[PDB]
Amino acid sequence: SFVIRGDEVRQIAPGQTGKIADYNYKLPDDFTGCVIAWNSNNLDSKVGGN
Amino acid sequence: SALGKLQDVVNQNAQALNTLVKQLSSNFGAISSVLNDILSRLDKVEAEVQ
């Protein structure tokens, strides 16, 4: 589990590339499993920036 | 004229090897017939399908 921005969720899949897949969290090509994601703006945003 | 029996055995084996080598120029529906070229144009999972 982790927090990312809404543009980045497509990098969390087998064989992908880009800043998150490159430098933060990499899935294998032989990945068996499920990727579950949801918007958390109601908790994880704040005025002036979280 | 009579040696055509032995020359035909030489010719048939040469045509069969030239055909086998010429078939490396074919795409078979892939983006390129060149294997390094595919690996440069596409990322891992898309290259694997080609």
Side-chain angles (χ1 to χ4, degrees):
Chain A
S1 61
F2 49 81
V3 183
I4 52 169
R5 80 178 217 243
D7 283 335
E8 296 177 317
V9 179
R10 62 173 55 80
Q11 303 187 18
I12 314 303
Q16 298 290 63
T17 56
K19 290 173 178 172
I20 301 306
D22 299 345
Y23 313 135
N24 296 266
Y25 181 84
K26 181 75 182 192
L27 292 175
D29 298 346
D30 56 291
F31 180 60
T32 301
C34 301
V35 173
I36 304 170
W38 65 107
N39 188 327
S40 64
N41 181 63
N42 67 324
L43 295 174
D44 290 330
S45 299
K46 191 169 178 177
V47 181
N50 182 11
Chain B
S1 61
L3 290 171
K5 289 185 181 183
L6 298 182
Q7 191 62 51
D8 186 69
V9 175
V10 177
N11 291 356
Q12 280 197 58
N13 285 277
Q15 180 59 253
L17 284 178
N18 291 348
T19 294
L20 181 71
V21 177
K22 282 286 298 181
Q23 282 287 68
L24 296 174
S25 305
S26 300
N27 288 355
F28 312 106
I31 188 170
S32 182
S33 61
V34 180
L35 183 53
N36 296 337
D37 186 19
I38 298 174
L39 289 166
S40 76
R41 294 186 198 217
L42 293 173
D43 209 352
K44 177 62 182 295
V45 169
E46 303 305 339
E48 165 176 313
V49 174
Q50 297 299 306

Coordinates of all heavy atoms in Angstrom, one line a residue:
Chain A
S1 N 0.8 -1.2 0.0 CA 0.0 0.0 0.0 C 0.8 1.3 0.0 O 1.9 1.4 0.6 CB -1.0 0.0 1.2 OG -0.3 -0.1 2.4
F2 N 0.3 2.3 -0.7 CA 0.9 3.6 -0.9 C 0.0 4.7 -1.4 O -1.1 4.4 -1.9 CB 2.1 3.5 -1.8 CG 1.9 2.7 -3.1 CD1 1.3 3.3 -4.2 CD2 2.3 1.3 -3.2 CE1 1.1 2.6 -5.4 CE2 2.0 0.6 -4.4 CZ 1.4 1.3 -5.5
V3 N 0.4 6.0 -1.4 CA -0.3 7.1 -2.0 C 0.4 7.6 -3.2 O 1.6 7.8 -3.2 CB -0.4 8.3 -1.0 CG1 -1.2 9.5 -1.6 CG2 -1.1 7.9 0.3
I4 N -0.3 7.8 -4.3 CA 0.2 8.4 -5.6 C -0.9 9.4 -6.1 O -2.0 9.4 -5.6 CB 0.5 7.4 -6.7 CG1 -0.6 6.3 -6.9 CG2 1.8 6.7 -6.3 CD1 -0.4 5.5 -8.1
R5 N -0.6 10.3 -7.1 CA -1.6 11.1 -7.7 C -2.4 10.4 -8.8 O -2.0 9.4 -9.4 CB -1.0 12.5 -8.2 CG -0.3 12.5 -9.5 CD 0.2 13.9 -9.9 NE 0.0 14.2 -11.3 CZ 1.0 14.4 -12.2 NH1 2.3 14.5 -11.8 NH2 0.7 14.6 -13.4
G6 N -3.6 10.9 -9.1 CA -4.6 10.2 -10.0 C -4.1 10.0 -11.4 O -4.5 9.0 -12.0
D7 N -3.2 10.8 -11.9 CA -2.5 10.5 -13.2 C -1.6 9.2 -13.2 O -1.4 8.6 -14.3 CB -1.6 11.7 -13.6 CG -2.4 12.9 -14.2 OD1 -3.5 12.7 -14.7 OD2 -1.9 14.0 -14.2
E8 N -1.1 8.9 -12.1 CA 0.0 7.9 -12.0 C -0.4 6.4 -11.9 O 0.4 5.5 -12.1 CB 0.9 8.2 -10.8 CG 1.6 9.6 -10.9 CD 2.4 10.0 -9.7 OE1 1.9 9.8 -8.6 OE2 3.5 10.6 -9.9
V9 N -1.7 6.2 -11.6 CA -2.3 4.8 -11.4 C -2.0 3.8 -12.5 O -1.6 2.7 -12.2 CB -3.8 4.9 -11.0 CG1 -4.4 3.5 -10.8 CG2 -4.0 5.8 -9.8
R10 N -2.0 4.3 -13.8 CA -1.6 3.4 -14.9 C -0.2 2.9 -14.9 O 0.1 2.0 -15.7 CB -2.0 4.2 -16.2 CG -1.2 5.5 -16.4 CD -1.5 6.1 -17.8 NE -2.9 6.3 -18.1 CZ -3.7 7.2 -17.7 NH1 -3.3 8.2 -17.0 NH2 -4.9 7.2 -18.1
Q11 N 0.7 3.5 -14.1 CA 2.1 3.0 -14.0 C 2.2 1.7 -13.1 O 3.1 1.0 -13.1 CB 3.0 4.1 -13.5 CG 3.0 5.3 -14.4 CD 4.1 6.4 -14.0 OE1 5.0 6.1 -13.2 NE2 4.0 7.6 -14.4
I12 N 1.1 1.5 -12.2 CA 1.0 0.3 -11.4 C 0.4 -0.8 -12.2 O -0.8 -1.2 -12.0 CB 0.2 0.7 -10.1 CG1 0.7 2.0 -9.4 CG2 0.3 -0.5 -9.1 CD1 2.2 2.0 -9.0
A13 N 1.1 -1.4 -13.1 CA 0.8 -2.6 -13.9 C 2.0 -3.3 -14.4 O 3.1 -2.7 -14.5 CB -0.2 -2.2 -15.0
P14 N 2.0 -4.6 -14.6 CA 3.1 -5.4 -15.1 C 3.8 -4.8 -16.3 O 3.1 -4.5 -17.3 CB 2.6 -6.8 -15.3 CG 1.1 -6.7 -15.5 CD 0.8 -5.5 -14.5
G15 N 5.1 -4.7 -16.4 CA 5.9 -4.3 -17.5 C 5.8 -2.8 -17.9 O 6.4 -2.4 -18.9
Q16 N 5.2 -2.0 -17.1 CA 5.1 -0.5 -17.3 C 6.4 0.2 -16.9 O 7.3 -0.4 -16.3 CB 4.0 0.1 -16.4 CG 2.6 -0.4 -16.8 CD 2.1 0.1 -18.1 OE1 2.6 -0.2 -19.2 NE2 1.0 0.9 -18.2
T17 N 6.5 1.4 -17.4 CA 7.7 2.4 -17.2 C 7.1 3.8 -16.9 O 6.0 4.1 -17.2 CB 8.6 2.4 -18.4 OG1 8.0 2.7 -19.6 CG2 9.4 1.1 -18.5
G18 N 7.9 4.7 -16.3 CA 7.5 6.0 -15.8 C 7.9 6.2 -14.4 O 8.1 5.2 -13.6
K19 N 8.0 7.5 -13.9 CA 8.7 7.8 -12.6 C 8.3 6.9 -11.4 O 9.2 6.6 -10.6 CB 8.3 9.3 -12.2 CG 8.9 10.3 -13.1 CD 8.3 11.7 -12.8 CE 9.0 12.8 -13.7 NZ 8.4 14.1 -13.5
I20 N 7.1 6.5 -11.2 CA 6.7 5.6 -10.1 C 7.2 4.2 -10.4 O 7.9 3.6 -9.5 CB 5.2 5.6 -9.9 CG1 4.7 7.1 -9.6 CG2 4.7 4.6 -8.8 CD1 5.4 7.7 -8.4
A21 N 7.0 3.6 -11.6 CA 7.4 2.3 -11.9 C 9.0 2.2 -12.0 O 9.6 1.2 -11.6 CB 6.8 1.9 -13.3
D22 N 9.6 3.3 -12.4 CA 11.1 3.5 -12.5 C 11.8 3.6 -11.2 O 12.8 3.0 -10.9 CB 11.4 4.7 -13.4 CG 10.8 4.7 -14.8 OD1 10.4 3.6 -15.3 OD2 10.8 5.7 -15.5
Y23 N 11.2 4.4 -10.2 CA 12.0 4.9 -9.1 C 11.3 4.6 -7.7 O 11.9 4.8 -6.7 CB 12.3 6.4 -9.2 CG 12.9 6.9 -10.5 CD1 12.4 8.0 -11.0 CD2 13.9 6.2 -11.1 CE1 12.9 8.6 -12.2 CE2 14.5 6.7 -12.3 CZ 14.0 7.9 -12.8 OH 14.5 8.4 -14.0
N24 N 10.1 4.1 -7.7 CA 9.3 4.0 -6.5 C 8.7 2.6 -6.2 O 8.9 2.1 -5.1 CB 8.2 5.0 -6.5 CG 8.7 6.4 -6.5 OD1 8.8 7.0 -5.4 ND2 9.1 7.0 -7.6
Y25 N 7.9 2.0 -7.1 CA 7.3 0.7 -6.9 C 7.1 0.0 -8.3 O 6.4 0.4 -9.2 CB 5.9 0.9 -6.3 CG 5.2 -0.4 -6.0 CD1 5.4 -1.2 -4.9 CD2 4.2 -0.9 -6.9 CE1 4.7 -2.4 -4.6 CE2 3.5 -2.1 -6.6 CZ 3.7 -2.8 -5.5 OH 3.0 -3.9 -5.2
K26 N 7.9 -1.1 -8.5 CA 7.9 -1.9 -9.7 C 7.2 -3.3 -9.5 O 7.6 -4.0 -8.7 CB 9.4 -2.1 -10.1 CG 9.6 -2.9 -11.4 CD 9.3 -2.1 -12.7 CE 9.5 -2.9 -13.9 NZ 9.5 -2.1 -15.2
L27 N 6.2 -3.6 -10.4 CA 5.7 -4.9 -10.5 C 6.5 -5.8 -11.5 O 7.0 -5.3 -12.5 CB 4.2 -4.8 -10.9 CG 3.3 -4.2 -9.9 CD1 1.9 -4.0 -10.5 CD2 3.2 -5.1 -8.6
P28 N 6.6 -7.1 -11.2 CA 7.2 -8.1 -12.2 C 6.4 -8.2 -13.5 O 5.2 -7.9 -13.5 CB 7.3 -9.4 -11.4 CG 6.2 -9.3 -10.4 CD 6.1 -7.8 -10.1
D29 N 7.0 -8.8 -14.5 CA 6.2 -9.1 -15.7 C 5.3 -10.3 -15.5 O 4.2 -10.4 -16.1 CB 7.2 -9.4 -16.9 CG 8.1 -8.2 -17.3 OD1 7.8 -7.0 -16.9 OD2 9.0 -8.4 -18.1
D30 N 5.7 -11.3 -14.7 CA 5.0 -12.5 -14.3 C 4.0 -12.2 -13.2 O 3.6 -13.2 -12.5 CB 5.9 -13.7 -14.1 CG 7.0 -13.4 -13.0 OD1 7.9 -12.5 -13.3 OD2 7.0 -14.0 -11.9
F31 N 3.6 -11.0 -12.9 CA 2.7 -10.6 -11.8 C 1.4 -11.4 -11.8 O 0.6 -11.3 -12.8 CB 2.5 -9.1 -11.8 CG 1.6 -8.6 -10.7 CD1 2.0 -8.8 -9.3 CD2 0.4 -7.9 -11.0 CE1 1.1 -8.4 -8.3 CE2 -0.4 -7.5 -9.9 CZ -0.1 -7.7 -8.6
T32 N 1.1 -12.1 -10.7 CA -0.3 -12.6 -10.5 C -0.8 -12.0 -9.2 O -0.2 -12.0 -8.2 CB -0.3 -14.2 -10.3 OG1 0.2 -14.8 -11.5 CG2 -1.7 -14.7 -10.1
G33 N -2.0 -11.3 -9.4 CA -2.5 -10.4 -8.3 C -3.5 -9.4 -8.9 O -3.8 -9.4 -10.0
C34 N -3.9 -8.5 -8.0 CA -4.9 -7.4 -8.3 C -4.4 -6.1 -7.8 O -3.9 -6.0 -6.7 CB -6.3 -7.8 -7.8 SG -7.0 -9.3 -8.5
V35 N -4.6 -5.0 -8.6 CA -4.2 -3.6 -8.3 C -5.6 -2.9 -8.0 O -6.4 -2.8 -8.9 CB -3.5 -3.0 -9.5 CG1 -3.3 -1.5 -9.3 CG2 -2.1 -3.6 -9.6
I36 N -5.7 -2.4 -6.8 CA -6.9 -1.7 -6.3 C -6.6 -0.3 -6.0 O -5.7 0.0 -5.2 CB -7.5 -2.5 -5.1 CG1 -7.7 -4.0 -5.4 CG2 -8.8 -1.8 -4.6 CD1 -8.0 -4.8 -4.2
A37 N -7.3 0.7 -6.6 CA -7.0 2.1 -6.3 C -8.3 3.0 -6.2 O -9.3 2.7 -6.8 CB -6.1 2.7 -7.5
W38 N -8.3 4.0 -5.4 CA -9.4 4.9 -5.2 C -8.9 6.4 -4.9 O -7.9 6.6 -4.2 CB -10.3 4.4 -4.1 CG -9.8 4.3 -2.7 CD1 -10.2 5.1 -1.7 CD2 -9.0 3.3 -2.1 NE1 -9.6 4.7 -0.5 CE2 -8.9 3.6 -0.7 CE3 -8.3 2.1 -2.6 CZ2 -8.1 2.8 0.1 CZ3 -7.5 1.3 -1.7 CH2 -7.4 1.7 -0.4
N39 N -9.7 7.4 -5.3 CA -9.5 8.8 -5.0 C -9.6 9.0 -3.5 O -10.6 8.6 -2.9 CB -10.4 9.6 -5.9 CG -10.2 11.1 -5.8 OD1 -9.8 11.6 -4.8 ND2 -10.5 11.8 -6.8
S40 N -8.7 9.7 -2.9 CA -8.7 9.9 -1.4 C -8.5 11.4 -1.1 O -8.1 11.8 0.0 CB -7.5 9.1 -0.8 OG -6.3 9.6 -1.3
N41 N -8.9 12.3 -2.1 CA -8.9 13.8 -1.9 C -9.6 14.3 -0.6 O -9.1 15.2 0.1 CB -9.6 14.4 -3.1 CG -9.7 15.9 -3.1 OD1 -8.6 16.6 -3.1 ND2 -10.8 16.5 -3.0
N42 N -10.7 13.6 -0.2 CA -11.4 13.9 1.1 C -10.6 13.6 2.4 O -11.0 14.2 3.4 CB -12.7 13.0 1.0 CG -12.4 11.5 1.2 OD1 -11.4 11.0 0.6 ND2 -13.2 10.7 1.9
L43 N -9.5 12.9 2.3 CA -8.6 12.6 3.4 C -7.2 13.2 3.2 O -6.6 13.7 4.2 CB -8.5 11.1 3.6 CG -9.7 10.3 4.0 CD1 -9.5 8.8 4.0 CD2 -10.2 10.8 5.4
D44 N -6.6 13.0 2.0 CA -5.2 13.2 1.8 C -4.8 14.6 1.2 O -3.6 14.9 1.1 CB -4.8 12.0 0.8 CG -4.7 10.7 1.6 OD1 -4.5 10.7 2.8 OD2 -4.9 9.6 0.9
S45 N -5.8 15.4 0.8 CA -5.6 16.8 0.4 C -5.7 17.7 1.6 O -6.5 17.5 2.5 CB -6.5 17.3 -0.7 OG -6.3 16.5 -1.9
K46 N -5.1 18.9 1.6 CA -5.3 20.0 2.6 C -5.1 21.4 1.9 O -4.2 21.5 1.0 CB -4.5 19.8 3.8 CG -4.9 20.7 5.0 CD -4.3 20.3 6.3 CE -4.7 21.3 7.4 NZ -4.1 20.9 8.7
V47 N -5.7 22.4 2.4 CA -5.5 23.8 1.8 C -4.1 24.3 2.2 O -3.7 24.1 3.3 CB -6.6 24.7 2.3 CG1 -6.5 26.2 1.8 CG2 -8.0 24.3 1.9
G48 N -3.5 24.9 1.2 CA -2.0 25.3 1.3 C -1.1 24.1 0.9 O 0.1 24.4 0.7
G49 N -1.6 22.9 0.7 CA -0.9 21.7 0.3 C -0.6 20.8 1.4 O 0.1 21.2 2.4
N50 N -1.0 19.5 1.3 CA -0.5 18.5 2.2 C 0.9 18.0 1.7 O 1.0 17.4 0.6 CB -1.5 17.3 2.2 CG -1.0 16.2 3.2 OD1 -0.1 16.3 3.9 ND2 -1.7 15.1 3.1
Chain B
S1 N 23.9 -32.7 -70.8 CA 22.4 -33.0 -70.8 C 22.0 -34.1 -69.9 O 21.0 -34.0 -69.2 CB 22.0 -33.2 -72.3 OG 22.7 -34.4 -72.8
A2 N 22.8 -35.2 -69.8 CA 22.4 -36.4 -69.0 C 22.8 -36.2 -67.5 O 22.1 -36.7 -66.6 CB 23.2 -37.6 -69.6
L3 N 23.8 -35.3 -67.2 CA 24.2 -34.9 -65.9 C 23.2 -34.0 -65.2 O 23.3 -33.8 -64.0 CB 25.6 -34.3 -65.9 CG 26.7 -35.3 -66.2 CD1 28.0 -34.5 -66.5 CD2 26.9 -36.2 -65.1
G4 N 22.1 -33.6 -65.8 CA 21.0 -32.9 -65.2 C 20.4 -33.6 -64.0 O 20.0 -32.9 -63.1
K5 N 20.5 -34.9 -63.9 CA 20.0 -35.6 -62.6 C 20.9 -35.2 -61.4 O 20.3 -35.1 -60.3 CB 20.1 -37.1 -62.8 CG 19.1 -37.7 -63.8 CD 19.2 -39.2 -63.8 CE 18.2 -39.9 -64.7 NZ 18.3 -41.3 -64.7
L6 N 22.2 -35.1 -61.6 CA 23.1 -34.7 -60.5 C 23.0 -33.2 -60.2 O 23.0 -32.8 -59.1 CB 24.5 -35.2 -60.7 CG 24.7 -36.7 -60.8 CD1 26.1 -37.1 -61.0 CD2 24.2 -37.5 -59.6
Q7 N 23.0 -32.4 -61.3 CA 22.8 -31.0 -61.2 C 21.5 -30.6 -60.5 O 21.5 -29.7 -59.7 CB 23.0 -30.3 -62.5 CG 23.1 -28.8 -62.4 CD 24.3 -28.4 -61.6 OE1 25.5 -28.8 -61.9 NE2 24.2 -27.5 -60.7
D8 N 20.4 -31.3 -60.8 CA 19.1 -31.0 -60.1 C 19.1 -31.2 -58.6 O 18.5 -30.5 -57.9 CB 18.0 -31.9 -60.8 CG 16.6 -31.5 -60.2 OD1 16.1 -30.4 -60.5 OD2 16.0 -32.4 -59.5
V9 N 19.9 -32.2 -58.1 CA 20.1 -32.4 -56.7 C 20.9 -31.3 -56.0 O 20.5 -30.8 -55.0 CB 20.7 -33.8 -56.4 CG1 21.1 -34.1 -55.0 CG2 19.8 -34.9 -56.9
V10 N 21.9 -30.8 -56.7 CA 22.6 -29.6 -56.3 C 21.7 -28.3 -56.3 O 21.7 -27.6 -55.3 CB 23.9 -29.4 -57.1 CG1 24.7 -28.1 -56.7 CG2 24.8 -30.6 -57.0
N11 N 21.0 -28.1 -57.4 CA 20.1 -27.0 -57.5 C 19.0 -27.0 -56.5 O 18.7 -25.9 -55.9 CB 19.5 -26.9 -58.9 CG 20.5 -26.6 -60.0 OD1 21.6 -26.3 -59.8 ND2 20.0 -26.6 -61.2
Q12 N 18.3 -28.1 -56.2 CA 17.2 -28.2 -55.3 C 17.6 -27.9 -53.8 O 16.9 -27.2 -53.1 CB 16.6 -29.6 -55.3 CG 15.6 -29.8 -56.5 CD 14.7 -31.0 -56.2 OE1 14.0 -31.1 -55.2 NE2 14.7 -32.0 -57.0
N13 N 18.8 -28.4 -53.4 CA 19.2 -28.1 -52.0 C 19.7 -26.6 -51.9 O 19.4 -26.0 -50.9 CB 20.3 -29.1 -51.7 CG 19.8 -30.5 -51.3 OD1 19.3 -30.7 -50.2 ND2 19.7 -31.4 -52.3
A14 N 20.3 -26.0 -52.9 CA 20.6 -24.6 -53.0 C 19.3 -23.7 -52.9 O 19.3 -22.8 -52.1 CB 21.5 -24.3 -54.2
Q15 N 18.3 -24.0 -53.7 CA 17.1 -23.2 -53.7 C 16.4 -23.3 -52.4 O 15.9 -22.3 -51.9 CB 16.2 -23.7 -54.9 CG 14.8 -23.0 -55.0 CD 14.9 -21.5 -55.2 OE1 14.7 -20.7 -54.3 NE2 15.4 -21.0 -56.3
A16 N 16.3 -24.5 -51.7 CA 15.7 -24.7 -50.4 C 16.4 -23.9 -49.3 O 15.7 -23.3 -48.5 CB 15.7 -26.2 -50.2
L17 N 17.8 -23.8 -49.3 CA 18.5 -23.0 -48.3 C 18.3 -21.5 -48.6 O 18.1 -20.7 -47.7 CB 20.0 -23.4 -48.3 CG 20.3 -24.6 -47.5 CD1 21.8 -24.9 -47.6 CD2 19.9 -24.5 -46.0
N18 N 18.3 -21.1 -49.9 CA 18.1 -19.7 -50.2 C 16.7 -19.2 -49.8 O 16.5 -18.2 -49.2 CB 18.3 -19.4 -51.7 CG 19.8 -19.5 -52.1 OD1 20.7 -19.5 -51.3 ND2 20.0 -19.4 -53.4
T19 N 15.7 -20.1 -50.0 CA 14.3 -19.9 -49.5 C 14.2 -19.7 -48.0 O 13.6 -18.8 -47.5 CB 13.4 -21.0 -50.0 OG1 13.3 -20.9 -51.4 CG2 11.9 -20.8 -49.5
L20 N 14.9 -20.6 -47.2 CA 15.0 -20.6 -45.8 C 15.6 -19.3 -45.3 O 15.1 -18.7 -44.3 CB 15.7 -21.8 -45.3 CG 15.8 -21.9 -43.8 CD1 14.5 -22.2 -43.1 CD2 16.8 -23.0 -43.4
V21 N 16.6 -18.8 -45.9 CA 17.3 -17.5 -45.6 C 16.5 -16.3 -46.0 O 16.3 -15.4 -45.1 CB 18.7 -17.5 -46.1 CG1 19.4 -16.1 -45.8 CG2 19.6 -18.6 -45.5
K22 N 15.9 -16.3 -47.2 CA 15.0 -15.2 -47.6 C 13.8 -15.0 -46.7 O 13.4 -13.9 -46.4 CB 14.5 -15.5 -49.0 CG 15.5 -15.2 -50.1 CD 15.7 -13.7 -50.4 CE 14.3 -13.0 -50.9 NZ 14.5 -11.6 -51.2
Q23 N 13.3 -16.1 -46.1 CA 12.2 -16.0 -45.1 C 12.6 -15.3 -43.8 O 11.7 -15.0 -43.0 CB 11.7 -17.4 -44.8 CG 10.7 -18.0 -45.9 CD 9.4 -17.3 -45.9 OE1 9.2 -16.1 -46.2 NE2 8.3 -17.9 -45.5
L24 N 13.8 -14.9 -43.5 CA 14.2 -14.0 -42.5 C 13.9 -12.5 -42.8 O 13.8 -11.7 -41.8 CB 15.7 -14.1 -42.1 CG 16.0 -15.5 -41.5 CD1 17.5 -15.6 -41.3 CD2 15.3 -15.8 -40.2
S25 N 13.6 -12.2 -44.0 CA 13.2 -10.8 -44.5 C 11.7 -10.6 -44.2 O 11.2 -9.4 -44.4 CB 13.5 -10.6 -45.9 OG 14.9 -10.9 -46.2
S26 N 10.9 -11.6 -43.9 CA 9.4 -11.5 -43.8 C 8.9 -11.0 -42.5 O 9.5 -11.2 -41.4 CB 8.8 -12.9 -44.1 OG 9.2 -13.3 -45.4
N27 N 7.8 -10.2 -42.4 CA 7.2 -9.7 -41.2 C 6.3 -10.8 -40.5 O 6.2 -10.7 -39.2 CB 6.3 -8.5 -41.5 CG 7.0 -7.2 -41.9 OD1 8.2 -7.1 -41.9 ND2 6.2 -6.2 -42.2
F28 N 5.6 -11.6 -41.2 CA 4.6 -12.5 -40.6 C 3.5 -11.7 -39.8 O 2.9 -12.2 -38.8 CB 5.2 -13.7 -39.8 CG 6.3 -14.4 -40.6 CD1 7.6 -14.2 -40.2 CD2 6.0 -15.2 -41.6 CE1 8.7 -14.8 -40.9 CE2 7.0 -15.9 -42.3 CZ 8.3 -15.7 -42.0
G29 N 3.2 -10.5 -40.2 CA 2.3 -9.6 -39.4 C 3.0 -8.7 -38.4 O 2.3 -7.8 -37.9
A30 N 4.3 -8.9 -38.0 CA 5.0 -8.0 -37.0 C 5.2 -6.6 -37.6 O 5.3 -6.4 -38.8 CB 6.3 -8.7 -36.6
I31 N 5.5 -5.7 -36.7 CA 5.8 -4.3 -37.0 C 7.1 -4.1 -37.9 O 7.2 -3.2 -38.7 CB 5.9 -3.4 -35.7 CG1 6.0 -1.9 -36.0 CG2 7.0 -3.9 -34.8 CD1 5.8 -1.1 -34.8
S32 N 8.0 -5.1 -37.8 CA 9.3 -5.1 -38.6 C 9.7 -6.6 -38.7 O 9.4 -7.4 -37.9 CB 10.4 -4.3 -37.9 OG 11.6 -4.3 -38.6
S33 N 10.5 -6.9 -39.8 CA 11.2 -8.2 -39.9 C 12.5 -8.2 -39.2 O 13.2 -9.3 -39.1 CB 11.4 -8.5 -41.4 OG 12.2 -7.5 -42.0
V34 N 12.9 -7.1 -38.6 CA 14.2 -7.0 -37.9 C 14.0 -7.0 -36.4 O 13.2 -6.2 -35.8 CB 15.0 -5.7 -38.3 CG1 16.3 -5.6 -37.6 CG2 15.3 -5.7 -39.8
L35 N 14.7 -7.9 -35.7 CA 14.4 -8.2 -34.3 C 14.9 -7.1 -33.3 O 14.1 -6.7 -32.4 CB 15.0 -9.6 -34.1 CG 14.8 -10.2 -32.7 CD1 13.3 -10.2 -32.3 CD2 15.2 -11.7 -32.8
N36 N 16.0 -6.5 -33.5 CA 16.5 -5.4 -32.8 C 15.7 -4.1 -33.0 O 15.5 -3.3 -32.1 CB 18.0 -5.1 -33.2 CG 19.0 -6.2 -32.8 OD1 18.7 -7.0 -32.0 ND2 20.1 -6.2 -33.5
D37 N 15.1 -3.9 -34.2 CA 14.2 -2.8 -34.6 C 13.0 -2.8 -33.7 O 12.7 -1.9 -33.0 CB 14.0 -2.9 -36.1 CG 13.2 -1.8 -36.7 OD1 13.2 -0.7 -36.0 OD2 12.6 -1.9 -37.8
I38 N 12.3 -4.0 -33.6 CA 11.1 -4.2 -32.7 C 11.5 -3.8 -31.3 O 10.8 -3.0 -30.7 CB 10.6 -5.7 -32.8 CG1 10.1 -6.0 -34.2 CG2 9.5 -5.9 -31.7 CD1 9.8 -7.5 -34.3
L39 N 12.6 -4.3 -30.8 CA 13.1 -4.0 -29.4 C 13.4 -2.5 -29.1 O 13.4 -2.1 -28.0 CB 14.3 -4.9 -29.1 CG 13.9 -6.4 -28.9 CD1 15.2 -7.2 -29.0 CD2 13.2 -6.6 -27.6
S40 N 13.6 -1.7 -30.2 CA 13.8 -0.3 -30.1 C 12.5 0.5 -30.2 O 12.4 1.5 -29.5 CB 14.9 0.2 -31.1 OG 14.3 0.2 -32.4
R41 N 11.6 0.1 -31.1 CA 10.3 0.9 -31.3 C 9.3 0.7 -30.2 O 8.4 1.6 -30.1 CB 9.7 0.4 -32.6 CG 10.5 0.8 -33.9 CD 9.7 0.4 -35.1 NE 10.6 0.3 -36.3 CZ 10.3 0.7 -37.6 NH1 9.3 1.4 -37.9 NH2 11.1 0.3 -38.5
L42 N 9.3 -0.4 -29.4 CA 8.3 -0.8 -28.5 C 8.9 -1.1 -27.1 O 10.0 -1.6 -27.0 CB 7.5 -2.0 -29.1 CG 6.7 -1.7 -30.3 CD1 6.1 -3.0 -30.9 CD2 5.5 -0.7 -30.0
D43 N 8.0 -0.9 -26.1 CA 8.4 -1.3 -24.7 C 8.0 -2.8 -24.4 O 7.3 -3.4 -25.2 CB 7.7 -0.3 -23.7 CG 8.4 -0.2 -22.4 OD1 9.4 -0.9 -22.1 OD2 8.1 0.7 -21.5
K44 N 8.7 -3.4 -23.4 CA 8.8 -4.8 -23.2 C 7.6 -5.7 -23.5 O 7.7 -6.6 -24.3 CB 9.2 -5.0 -21.7 CG 9.3 -6.5 -21.2 CD 10.4 -7.2 -21.9 CE 10.5 -8.7 -21.5 NZ 10.9 -8.9 -20.1
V45 N 6.4 -5.4 -23.0 CA 5.2 -6.2 -23.2 C 4.7 -6.1 -24.6 O 4.2 -7.1 -25.2 CB 4.1 -5.8 -22.2 CG1 2.8 -6.5 -22.5 CG2 4.6 -6.3 -20.8
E46 N 4.8 -4.9 -25.3 CA 4.3 -4.8 -26.7 C 5.3 -5.4 -27.6 O 4.9 -6.1 -28.6 CB 4.1 -3.3 -27.0 CG 3.1 -2.6 -26.1 CD 1.7 -3.2 -26.1 OE1 1.3 -4.0 -26.9 OE2 1.0 -2.9 -25.1
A47 N 6.6 -5.3 -27.4 CA 7.7 -5.9 -28.1 C 7.6 -7.4 -28.1 O 7.6 -8.1 -29.1 CB 9.0 -5.4 -27.6
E48 N 7.3 -8.0 -26.9 CA 7.1 -9.5 -26.7 C 6.0 -10.0 -27.6 O 6.1 -11.1 -28.2 CB 6.8 -9.7 -25.2 CG 6.2 -11.1 -24.9 CD 6.1 -11.3 -23.4 OE1 7.1 -11.0 -22.6 OE2 5.0 -11.7 -22.9
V49 N 4.9 -9.3 -27.8 CA 3.8 -9.7 -28.7 C 4.2 -9.7 -30.2 O 3.8 -10.6 -31.0 CB 2.5 -8.8 -28.5 CG1 1.4 -9.1 -29.5 CG2 2.0 -9.1 -27.1
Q50 N 5.0 -8.7 -30.6 CA 5.5 -8.6 -32.0 C 6.6 -9.6 -32.2 O 6.6 -10.2 -33.3 CB 6.1 -7.2 -32.2 CG 5.0 -6.1 -32.1 CD 3.9 -6.3 -33.1 OE1 4.1 -6.4 -34.3 NE2 2.6 -6.3 -32.8

